[PDB]
Design a protein around this ligand. Structure first.
Ligand SMILES: COc1oc([C@H]2C/C(=C/C(C)=C/c3ccc([N+](=O)[O-])cc3)CO2)c(C)c(=O)c1C
Ligand code: SF4
Ligand code: SF4
Ligand code: SF4
Lengths: 384, 166, 353, 196, 127, 180
């Protein structure tokens, strides 16, 4: 039965079309059709100044976006030699792991709701709501926040940010332990997920499945450990792993990821000493807002930086990072001009989707939904 | 019969349709997660009557264009709108849907009023869940005939009633 | 109906009309209360809107449902498309009269119930099959095989547990020896609360009632979240409303039968009020069931079928064999109290390992 | 450890080794030796094939060998059986009027989707592919978007009373071939790099 | 690619397009109604580019309510295109000053640009 | 693991008795941060002169290009801006606007600064181009809100509260946490 599990219907979150070649209640093979969200970042970004593109970057993966902001930022910093202040780096890892907790919350809520129960969507979402407030505190936006900058971050943290963060970091561990107490000793989910989702690590490696679904099959491969970028070299870290790749091990490993990310948030919070906020190089940083009325160089640099932008040298660059869905990176080709020559994005959810016909082959027809929720796609990342 | 032709009954049925607005989600992009968040346990569009959420299009009146409308999805969503009962309303959510948004290119429909008749426009990126509540209230009073535009006109109760389908 | 009188036919028609419109109001307001109780469960709060307490929102829902362009989809069977909701509603409304809400005359003079047939449980079984009938017929009529497979799932699973319903209802009949609910309830008045003797079979009855789309197989299915269900996805204005109405009436009739048959249909040992205790037990089971509605996953109808067929039914027929031994030799009835207490202790203490 | 042996192998055969002072390595193989060399590369222990990035240099200020250029990324995961962590790139130019390339789908299944994208976005047809079908762009879309001679295809912005904007006529930012708004751009707007 | 019709003569443009259309089957063709100012259709002016794949057809800005009988001629035009089996309808939004020079660019450039900028449309907005 | 069903039931019940968590917009004022991205406001100096000098630095740095600025030369008798230049026409298409803060960040005079209104839902594209006199700090409410208050005769109440308004919003009058 080549059944048309269409785009967005029935409840294929992240609009995606499926031709399930399938007779009965088994699953022979699923033929996917994507592109239903193709908006054109790789092309539009070729007509926007480097400063502007920070407005285009978070909106690709709208759940874990600061990884996109950080990947783009770091690649350009390397390309033009920018300096990360220690406080800016600590703040960037704070926002990185916190957006990772938020993306993880949304992923498990969607997975539970996609087939099964509705209740635990809200509780996790409750915490997510709190997290958003924290972001709205510093960036003034829930998500899609345009805060990061090439040198560092836009402006400083408010007085009210840190105590709220402490409140949420003190309440969260019990909350995550509660989710794991509910789910890990699974009543029916045990008979639903432990068997399903055949993930042989060999083919997961062969098809490009980096997004935390591979270490659920027992592969210790994380960019934070393999390629430390934002100071992760300097963190006490437990690296989650799975015994055998299924949906159950995936979800449990991601929950342990959330706890380790909360621990990293606290750890970074403690080591925070006042200081600067962004790379002071005037060629790369606009003049501070106060001496716009004293210095000529200030006005000229502000005018230029905010009409033209800046010109990094000619060259190609690329640096990878670890998002809630795996290895991510921007291939930046710059021709020495105010607008990037090309930006090619390694979309983890894009190739992580090759393992759809494979994983759900021979599995159930309903379980084709649970195995998609467990694959954690963000079709803003795939379609792009 | 269109909910008209009685001084009492048209008020009654407009009351009914306006308060019992049953949204038909079409989750497309990051606007759609701000549409989902309008139902959680802090700010829920689960009060005016929108508790239940008919995923099938044969059963829901409000279709919210929630996210960037990539062209390869334009016709499908079109038929999703044509797969709706006739007493149906469409809200255009976000900047990517209302206008072309910031993505001004070959991949995006630069105004979703092209493919579907829009009832209410709601800017924002994404429009705050509370702006979505304000828009559903806008549409609430619009379908009662309690809506006036800047130019001084009262607006029809149901948009997509004035289009020669084809 | 050995001892029970008969009201005139016009009173039968009047009371049936009362039951139908009361079931309308009841299912509307129970949809409200379930929304609000789920809200209390999942923190969020309910619609303090159009009501205050929501009690004008069913009106908005019903007014929306009508005028909604009741459409007859082309490529669909002209006849069954229209006919199946009426079947699903008719064969849901009836089978509510037999449930006794009091001793005769406690309707302020005439009759608490509607009909008191000699063979009741068979009547319930027969009209219960017809709900699955309307389900899968509507699935076929829609002309969408996506709903056909959902209808087939519904019918298969519901039919498996529907077979199990017979092995459940056998057990108390051996004890009482009558198939009229009033005699059974009066027996439960004498010795007390029939489930005390037959708790295991009681279980497999209760769980069987869960398979009838109540919740937790939840692979009826509904169009949501899975291979879309049948009897919907093609009906717009009232026929979908009729499906929802009949399915909820079946829900509340089953949740009322569960206390009526095994537990104490109103007939309280003390304070003996006709209606209020029945309504309170209905609400008790409803609240536990809503707890379940909020708190548990699906079953995927493969494990559901295996569980019903291999696990529920052999266990139920085993209990039937034990109870039939006891009744045929008739030595005590207390031995059944002892055995059911031991069985519950086993089925409970085996949990906390 | 294996990256050093990759360099010793390729430099011995005279293939240019591209390196920026940032820590990323490019290895350009010719068309013929491409397939066999990269097969040997996978045999050399390269578990992971990360990216296939297609490039159009039509409007690049400095001239380049060929217009289109496809870059694959070969990696060996550090936490797997015997993982050095060796990751590197392979660039292979493809002529303007000869958009050919043999696939490595048979070696890594990851090139199933990725190469299709480069066939979707660029005019590059991948040889030996199981299915070369348009992935992202609409089925009726004519052309290959990401090549510079293909329009971005913008729509004006709208205002009250005849007041409009044509963004491509509005942009103050300069590309590489844009001479600038003055007679020219020199100094720090022709390329600037801080010395840490 | 042919250019039939004339600016600001809706009825003559419509009759010449009637004649030049003939019995041409539009099952896989594309109709691009090019205009300016997305939102305001009450005062809109329209061009048409018909991309059949085997030869293409041009109509200058002569339809729409901005001209006397452009609204009725555009309604008849969309009805005519729909009668012949057209399903894929598009709208292009250009700057007013473009509309004039876009009919004088070579066919490949004009047509490429139009196909890249096209918006799927519901013909009900023109009927 | 039958115990897990019971544990799930028990925790769901415990939350059942836990009544509070929600905020009921519009009946309860939405708690916003002082840095929130809302409707733009044009601020004025103490002299009353407007801060905007019509320099179109907001429009160029806009990734959607939604900002329109026609300039003009001040009249020495009754000047509008501080310098020799003011903004005759200042339009922002909220259907193009993506709420970055790039116009706020690039404004050298501090004139254009985002406010807090989100209640700008309207029916018509052509009406969602908010103009100069549609964003001044002096104005209290959004376009549909002001039209409703006019066709209704009932004054405007914004449905949000913030702990305080920023110093960049000098003159921005709004409800502050309940001080009034
Ligand atoms: C699922 O996650 C996601 O969704 C979407 C789209 C689809 C969608 C579906 C449903 C079913 C919402 C829904 C939720 C709850 C209810 N309810 O009644 O509770 C009703 C409807 C909403 O956005 C996108 C785009 C996404 O990228 C991710 C990760
Ligand atoms: S308006 Fe913003 S939030 Fe909404 S779809 Fe567009 S980019 Fe996403
Ligand atoms: S906030 Fe951004 S999109 Fe909005 S007007 Fe300012 S610069 Fe443009
Ligand atoms: S708002 Fe500010 S940036 Fe824009 S033109 Fe006025 S003074 Fe310049």
């Amino acid at each position: 039965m080549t059944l048309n599990v269409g785009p967005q219907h029935p409840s294929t979150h992240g609009v995606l079309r499926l031709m399930v070649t399938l007779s009965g209640e088994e699953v022979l093979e699923v033929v996917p059709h994507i592109g239903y969200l193709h908006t054109g970042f790789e092309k539009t970004m070729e007509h926007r100044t480097y400063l502007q593109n920070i407005t285009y970057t978070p909106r690709m993966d709208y759940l874990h976006s600061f990884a996109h902001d950080l990947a783009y930022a770091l690649a350009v910093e390397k390309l033009l030699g920018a300096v990360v202040p220690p406080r800016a780096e600590t703040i960037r890892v704070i926002l990185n792991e916190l957006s990772r907790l938020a993306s993880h919350l949304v992923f498990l809520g969607t997975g539970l709701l996609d087939l099964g129960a509705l209740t635990p969507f809200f509780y996790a979402f409750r915490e997510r709501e709190t997290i958003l407030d924290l972001f709205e505190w510093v960036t003034g936006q829930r998500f899609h926040h345009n805060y990061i900058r090439i040198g560092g971050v836009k402006e400083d943290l408010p007085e009210e940010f840190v105590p709220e963060l402490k409140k949420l970091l003190e309440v969260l561990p019990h909350r995550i332990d509660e989710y794991e107490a509910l789910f890990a000793e699974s009543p029916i989910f045990y008979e639903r997920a432990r068997g399903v989702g055949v993930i042989p690590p060999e083919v997961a490696i062969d098809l490009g499945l980096t997004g935390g679904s591979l270490r659920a099959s027992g592969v210790n491969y994380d960019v934070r450990k393999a390629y430390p970028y934002s100071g992760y070299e300097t963190y006490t870290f437990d690296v989650p792993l799975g015994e055998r790749g299924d949906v159950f091990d995936r979800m449990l490993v991601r929950i342990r990821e959330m706890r380790e990310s909360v621990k990293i948030i606290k750890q970074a919070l403690e080591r925070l000493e006042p200081g600067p906020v962004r790379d002071p190089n005037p060629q790369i940083t606009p003049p501070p807002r106060h001496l716009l009325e004293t210095s000529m160089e200030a006005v000229i640099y502000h005018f230029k930086h905010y009409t033209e932008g800046f010109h990094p040298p000619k060259g190609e660059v690329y640096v990878p990072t670890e998002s809630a869905r795996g290895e991510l990176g921007y291939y930046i080709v710059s021709d020495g001009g105010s607008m990037p020559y090309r930006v090619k994005v390694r979309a983890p959810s894009f190739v992580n989707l090759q393992s759809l016909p494979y994983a759900c082959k021979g599995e159930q027809v309903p379980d084709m939904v649970a195995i998609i929720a467990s694959l954690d796609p963000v079709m803003g990342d795939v379609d792009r | 019969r269109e909910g008209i032709l009685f001084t009492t009954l048209e008020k009654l049925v407009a009351w009914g349709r306006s308060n019992s607005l049953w949204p038909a989600t079409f989750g497309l992009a990051c606007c759609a997660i701000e549409m989902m968040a309008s139902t959680d346990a802090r700010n829920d569009l689960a009060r005016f009557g929108s508790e239940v959420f008919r995923a099938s299009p044969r059963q829901a009146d409000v279709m919210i264009v929630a996210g960037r409308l990539s062209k390869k999805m334009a016709p499908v969503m079109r038929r999703v709108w044509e797969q709706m009962p006739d007493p149906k309303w469409v809200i255009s959510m976000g900047a990517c849907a209302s206008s072309g948004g910031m993505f001004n290119n070959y991949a995006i429909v630069q105004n979703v009023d092209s493919v579907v008749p829009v009832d209410v426009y709601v800017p924002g990126c994404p429009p705050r869940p509370e702006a979505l509540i304000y828009a559903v209230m806008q549409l609430q009073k619009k379908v009662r005939g309690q809506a006036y535009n800047e130019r001084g006109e009262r607006l029809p109760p149901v948009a997509a009633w004035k289009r020669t389908r084809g | 109906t050995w001892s029970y009188p008969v009201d005139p036919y016009w009173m039968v028609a009047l009371k049936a009309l009362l039951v139908v419109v009361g079931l309308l109001t009841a299912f509307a307001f129970m949809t409200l209360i379930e929304r609000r109780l789920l809200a209390r469960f999942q923190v969020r709060m309910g619609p303090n809107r159009v009501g205050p307490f929501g009690l004008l929102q069913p009106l908005a829902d019903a007014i929306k449902s009508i005028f909604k362009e009741d459409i007859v989809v082309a490529q669909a069977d002209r006849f069954l498309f229209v006919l199946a909701p009426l079947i699903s509603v008719v064969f849901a409304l009836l089978a509510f009269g037999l449930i006794p809400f009091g001793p005769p005359g406690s309707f302020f003079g005439y009759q608490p119930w509607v009909i008191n047939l000699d063979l009741g449980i068979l009547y319930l079984f027969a009209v219960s099959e017809l709900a699955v009938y309307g389900i899968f017929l509507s699935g076929w009529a829609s002309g969408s095989k996506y709903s056909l497979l959902g209808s087939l799932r519904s019918s298969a699973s519901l039919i498996s547990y529907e077979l199990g319903l017979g092995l459940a209802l056998l057990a108390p009949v051996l004890l009482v020896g009558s198939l009229n609910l009033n005699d059974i309830v009066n027996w439960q008045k004498e010795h007390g609360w029939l489930f005390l003797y037959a708790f295991p079979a009681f279980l497999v009855y209760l769980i069987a009632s869960m398979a009838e789309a109540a919740r937790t197989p939840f692979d009826l299915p509904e169009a949501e979240q899975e291979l879309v269900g049948g009897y919907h996805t093609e009906y717009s204005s009232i026929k979908w409303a009729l499906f929802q109405m009949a399915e909820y009436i079946h829900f509340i009739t089953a949740s009322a039968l569960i206390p009526t048959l095994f537990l104490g249909g109103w007939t309280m040992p003390v304070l003996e009020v006709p209606y209020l205790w029945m309504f309170l037990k209905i609400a008790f089971f409803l609240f536990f069931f809503i707890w379940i509605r909020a708190t548990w996953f699906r079953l995927r109808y493969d494990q559901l079928l295996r569980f019903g067929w291999g696990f529920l039914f052999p266990l139920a027929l085993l209990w039937f064999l034990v109870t039939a031994l006891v009744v045929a030799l008739d030595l005590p009835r207390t031995y059944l109290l002892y055995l059911s207490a031991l069985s519950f202790l086993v089925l409970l203490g085996a949990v906390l390992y | 450890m294996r990256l050093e042996r990759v360099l010793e192998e390729a430099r011995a055969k005279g293939y240019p080794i591209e390196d920026n002072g940032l820590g990323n390595l490019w290895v350009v193989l010719p068309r013929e030796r491409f397939k066999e060399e990269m097969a040997h590369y996978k045999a050399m222990g390269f578990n992971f094939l990360a990216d296939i990035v297609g490039l159009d240099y039509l409007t690049y200020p400095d001239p380049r060998p060929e217009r289109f250029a496809v870059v694959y990324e070969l990696v060996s995961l550090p936490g797997w059986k015997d993982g050095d962590g060796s990751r590197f790139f392979v660039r292979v130019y493809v002529p303007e009027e000869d958009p050919r390339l043999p696939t490595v789908t048979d070696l890594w299944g990851s090139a199933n989707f990725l190469e299709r994208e480069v066939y979707d976005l660029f005019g590059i047809v991948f040889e030996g592919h199981p299915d070369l079908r348009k992935i992202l762009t609409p089925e009726d879309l004519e052309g290959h978007p990401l090549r510079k001679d293909y329009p971005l295809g913008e729509t004006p912005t709208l205002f009250r009373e005849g007041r409009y904007i044509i963004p491509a006529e509005f942009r103050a930012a300069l590309t590489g071939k844009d001479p600038g708004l003055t007679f020219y751009k020199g100094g720090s707007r022709k390329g600037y790099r801080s010395l840490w | 690619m042919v250019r039939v019709g004339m600016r600001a003569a809706p009825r003559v443009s419509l009759e010449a397009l009637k004649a030049a259309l003939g019995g041409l089957k539009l099952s896989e063709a594309k109709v691009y109604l090019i205009t300016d100012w997305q939102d305001k259709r009450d005062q809109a002016r329209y061009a048409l580019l018909l991309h059949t794949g085997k030869k293409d057809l041009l109509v200058p800005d002569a339809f729409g309510p901005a001209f006397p009988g452009g609204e009725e001629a555009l309604s008849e035009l969309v009805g005519l295109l729909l009668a012949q089996g057209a399903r894929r309808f598009y709208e292009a939004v250009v700057s007013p000053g473009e509309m004039t020079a876009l009919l004088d660019l070579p066919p490949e450039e004009l047509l490429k640009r139009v196909m890249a900028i096209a918006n799927p449309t519901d013909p009900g907005i023109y009927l | 693991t039958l115990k897990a069903l019971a544990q799930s039931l028990g925790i769901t019940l415990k939350y059942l008795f836990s009544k509070p968590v929600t905020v009921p917009y519009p009946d309860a004022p939405v708690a916003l941060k002082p840095r929130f991205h809302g409707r733009h406001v044009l601020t004025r100096h103490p002299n009353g002169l407007e801060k905007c000098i019509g320099c179109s630095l907001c429009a160029a740095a806009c990734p959607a290009y939604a900002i329109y600025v026609e300039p003009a030369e001040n009249d020495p008798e009754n000047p509008v801006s501080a310098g020799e230049r003011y903004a005759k026409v200042y339009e922002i298409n909220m259907l193009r606007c993506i709420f970055c803060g790039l116009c706020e960040e690039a404004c050298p005079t501090g004139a254009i600064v985002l406010g807090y209104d989100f209640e700008m839902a309207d029916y018509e594209y052509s009406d969602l181009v908010y103009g100069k006199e549609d964003m001044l700090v002096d104005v209290v409410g959004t376009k549909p809100q002001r039209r409703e208050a006019k066709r209704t005769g009932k004054p405007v109440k914004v449905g949000y509260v913030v702990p305080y308004v920023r110093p960049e919003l000098e003159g921005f009058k709004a409800p502050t946490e309940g001080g009034k």
